[model samples]
Target chain A: VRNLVIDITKKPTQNIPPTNEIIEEAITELNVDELLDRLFEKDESGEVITPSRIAKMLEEKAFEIYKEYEKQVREAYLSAGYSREKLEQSFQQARFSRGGKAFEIIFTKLLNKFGIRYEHDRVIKIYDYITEGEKPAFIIPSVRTFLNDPSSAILITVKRKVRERWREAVGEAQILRNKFGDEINFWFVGFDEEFTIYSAIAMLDNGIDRVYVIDGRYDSLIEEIKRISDPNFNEDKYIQKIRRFSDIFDDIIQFLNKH
Target chain B: RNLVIDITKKPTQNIPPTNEIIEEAITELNVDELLDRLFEKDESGEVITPSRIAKMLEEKAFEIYKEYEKQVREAYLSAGYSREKLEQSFQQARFSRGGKAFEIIFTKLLNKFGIRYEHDRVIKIYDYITEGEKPAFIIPSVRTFLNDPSSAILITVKRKVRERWREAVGEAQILRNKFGDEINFWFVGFDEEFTIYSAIAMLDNGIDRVYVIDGRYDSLIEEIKRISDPNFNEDKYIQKIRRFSDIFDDIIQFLNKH
Candidate 1:
């Protein structure tokens, strides 16, 4: 039974984490009533169903399933008498796989629930000279709108976590601006892990239009940024760009409806 | 009551002893014979290829790592450290050593080849934006880039590339967008975890050349050459796929003319 569970997790790519659909199936088979109740919770005061709230629930459920699978894998390895180093390497691959695809999956789910019209995970050929093009995480409205009139388009680039690597987003932003103009909005959406003042400042200094973080600490991050910034730095001017995760879908809805 | 044993120890000869002349911490830079061998010219006067450079460095890195590991283990044992403590310390050191070691070693080779370059810097490519590019190496100097942007070459070196190639692409696009495409941007990798698709994607974008250390991307390389050198009078914009040795020859020619 232990080996069977492990075998099911192994795809051709090896150690590819469970997809969101698989997680939902696992929940159903396991009869996880608590997870279901929490997901479909009702409030006396009528709590708002925001994307942030749904994201948190889905993330928690993913963590539970991941931990359960990790436990089973650990027991199976230990019983089979695997070497310590071998076990550690498996854990590393597990984390890498999970961290890589989890948030993107959750974000896609939220978008579907909200019925937001967008494209996900595609490499579009921007230039005819060569077949290579930019791969943006999410393009609002449609790719057609972006290709025809980029000034109205919005490209949301997602990163689970960011460090100095946020400069990559600047590269994408620059490419869009080069082909189109400066008017196209290039926003960054990240999970709240390791997104910091330095990354925020670097994004702002470069050309990212906005920063949306999942379950973020907006005021604290801004306050810390403001504390260390130059005396000439204007707080009110840039602070509007940093927003909550919930506001992204809301802003998209607003943009779509207006058109 | 404590018990102590009087022990006499004799050391082995493989280590070649410590630096007994620790007087001033200053030593003459003695070039290695192996370094000379690496730079030796062939019958056609062609000195190096990306494969040779990668192989030479890989072997050298292995030698240095083994030596360093032995010394570190010895020091830790001599200082009365636990096995776990020694392992922790070594792992911490190895983490930082991975990327920086490649940069330092590659820069040394660059110097030996008499290619003037700057390492570990962030330069502002755009006049309007405050953010800058942290290129692994910049040919000539930052001053030349500031004076004549078209004459400089920006190189980014990676141990391996998967999704990280996009970041380099973005950096290249930013520079080309501002500088009008005369600036050369090159991406170098050790061919670890690299795919032909990623190489093609990079070439399709703003990067002018994609140089791999190992000669693994032969199929892609052949396709690029074919597309680039077609027998047609019409002008074509061709991206170069090259070996590590080609970098030296190309740069030498670049330096002579510019």
Candidate 2:
């Protein structure tokens, strides 16, 4: 049987019970019924009911309740274990990025531990970051033309400009495929339609893992990417494509030997 | 009030004057004696022909000579004046008509008696008679009556009407109530003459055996009377009527007592 897991974070705030009695008592004092009555009260027909009116009322009541309970339950939680200052510090540290420098540190550590040989350069193509090998694993920050319309030229230009820094770091060479029959794996990354950062990972025929990460203002996109890519490169379309090619290549080699 | 009159000894002139007059005649006559006379056989041990009786009554009964003549004429027309056939036909008609009327009256009576009954057209009286107290009568439609006269009089009328269908039904319900058993009520279309005949038969059989004495020459009335007599047993008339009334009473009393 599949387990049904409910994440309460998405539920309405009012429906969630307070953790502490003081917070609960403070919430009770806000008079939700009264707030709702004021929010919905109308003078006559034909008057539009907008979200702003309801939002304002909720904000006013929520703030009032928070003020009353903050000193009690909020301080209690903080004193017990939760430190708001430390949380803010952790958030800032995790979000700051020095181009691919942070990723390079982790990669270098992993390579040093495993004794894997690798090469790096800074004067190649603007949006191509690749590992030089039999099967090259590369990252390409290219504009995806979904509708393939001329109107998408502006979107392509904007994407190219936005990925300029990653391209600069990697250099300005055209990440070309080898003349010999060799599978090339490519990872595409950038801001999505909502301006949220995302990463697409893929693998090459030479057994190289390529990963891409989008630049976003908040960690929400990063979290979403983590969910999609956890345990394996489950969701990256390019990664799946490369994986399929490798399986087919292995079968072909086996068939040749048998003949 | 009851009055006793010797119809056998008295002249037909003195019997009674009219149909209404016969009500008085019945009131005066000894019920047992009149029953015997009305149903008595002749020297040959055959029932007296209605015409002969009428002539004797006309010669002797000065009080009801005209009524006696009229009744005789009706009996002749209704029974076809054939001494051998009149009694049979009269008995057959009476038994049949009475059985139907009883069924209607009895069913209604059963309802009054608090018995829940489903009105069923195809159900036999015997089937229900076994379940509860045998009903006083299983009122049948005129169609049933005309079809089977021997078995027809195996019931009695609780009430009667001139309209064959209505009378059949009404009497059946009355019998049903009286017997405190479920019974059927069958109805026929309206006809004034038929209704009048049925009504008289029902009254005669329901209350007392009193024959109507008027308009004897009227073809309809004569025909009705000829079919109303109780003694004429050409098709086992006496046995059938008696059996009908007996079954009727048995069912009614059984239901009521229970």
Candidate 3:
């Protein structure tokens, strides 16, 4: 016979303190008739009511605030062809070269513009898992060489074309970082001779540290875009031969400076 | 100048060449006569010998001979008979020789072996009957017993009452487990109120035989025997004994079957 004991003395005397019994009683007495009625109410097809049926209701209620935001990002990368896939690949490749530190810096800069501040190292360390599975077998190391080299330019152009779509993706990420801390690190790694970008965030709390991987594959997105726009389609398998230009000096310097 | 040279070249013929005469005298001299001439008899009949040059020469010669003899003996021993060599000889003698010859052969044995053999002689031959072909048993010291845990238990409790009897069985079990064979547990009660409880755990591990012994006084032996007898079982004590026996039997049976 397990029993729960409650101390009533802890409650403030001035306020009408709600005990468990009182809360339960109040909850039981609440009038849910209107709410139940609205839930059961049917449309022309006899389907129960739903908020989704209120077409453009979210747009109207939210004052179409994201419209200008989306338009601005879309216009910025319009010539480059904006898509979530492109944005993610660009961000991932950027993070690969920077070892995800650049994303932390960019996020910090973006937050500073909005008058928000954070501990950068803690935030960046949280995002290290994004590149965990994104370890590329080969990376070009030089973007200039990738653009100029005849053998590598074709793959580079295709990669850049695919990366043009990532503006919205980057924007969404920026928004998330602004709201949450810069805890997510995203990068691309090669698996089975194919490049894939994985996004991950680290959570450390309650004496436990964990890395959470988010679902998304850059290659699949590229293929989907290629199917729609065959003219811009680049299916060169040799694109995966590109290697990461990892700078150990920057990492050491960053670590030392932070410490 | 020529006249002086001719006079010097004449070889001084008048001196008569005393070198040959001196050599002849040395060759003709008798040592006994020389010694007699150097000493004179005193009134008490003891010789009043002078400290003659020949006496010094004789003493030097005697000293040199004694030193040479000592060096020869030392060289012979150093070259042929080292400590290792002596130990090898002693071991050889122990295996080959018996009785007086054994002592004679091992006379130059190392001090360690000599002390050991002396100790072994008392226990192996005098204390134990060694008439048979079987090798004589040497009594192990308490230190040896304690060093070997299995034998230590037996040696410590070979005399106590019920506890001793229990310990004996436990030791027997341990030996049986270790050696995989039954061991003889014997006791000889003497008329002098002292007893010798000897137990030999013999092992034949496809190599050679090994025996361990534990001896005790008579009074403790009797007490152990009384306690160990199955017929002396009181009800409560019998129950405890049965429990222990059951456990031991199960363990032993399991081990044997396996």
TM-score for each model: 0.72, 0.15, 0.11
Candidate achieving higher TM-score, 2 or 3: 2
What is the lDDT, from 0 to 100, of the residue A19 in candidate 3?
A: 28
Q: For candidate 2, lDDT tens digit of each residue in A32-90?
A: 33433443345246443222233223334444443333334333444455544333232
Question: Which prediction has the highest TM-score against the true structure?
Answer: 1
- The clash count of every prediction, one per candidate, is 3, 73, 15
**Model 2 interface Cα RMSD in Å:** 56.2
Using lDDT as the measure, what is the rank order of every candidate, best first? 1, 2, 3
| Residue-level lDDT tens digits of model 1 in A86-161 | 4544555565567646667777766665578778766666555456577788887678888777767788898766
- Candidate 1 clashing pairs, residues 3+ apart or interchain: B49-B245, B50-B244, B50-B245
Predicted complex 3: DockQ:
0.00
lDDT by residue (A1-259, candidate 3, tens digit) is 1122323232211122212222223223432223223533685578653222221122122222222222333344443444433433333333233323322232232223323322321211112212111111111223233223312211110011122122222222232233233543222221111222211100111000111111123345344323443344233422232222121113223423443
Chain A TM-score for predicted structure 1: 0.79
**lDDT of all the models against the reference?**
0.62, 0.30, 0.25
**What is candidate 1's CA lDDT for residue A26?**
41
TM-score of 3: 0.11
What does candidate 2's lDDT look like per residue over B14-36, in tens digits?
A: 22333334334334432224334
Q: With candidate 3 superimposed using the best TM-score fit, by how many Å does residue A51's alpha carbon deviate from the native?
A: 32
Over 4 Å off, model 2: A1-259, B1-24, B27-31, B34-45, B48-164, B167-258
Q: Name the regions of candidate 3 deviating beyond 4 angstroms.
A: A1-100, A123-259, B1-258
lDDT tens readout by residue for model 3, B1-258: 011111122212211222322223323433234444433654456442322222223333334333433343344355563432333333333222222221221121212122221112211111122311111111123243224423311211111131122223332333333333332221111112221121110111110111111122234334334443343322322222111112222223323442
Give the top-scoring candidate (DockQ): 1
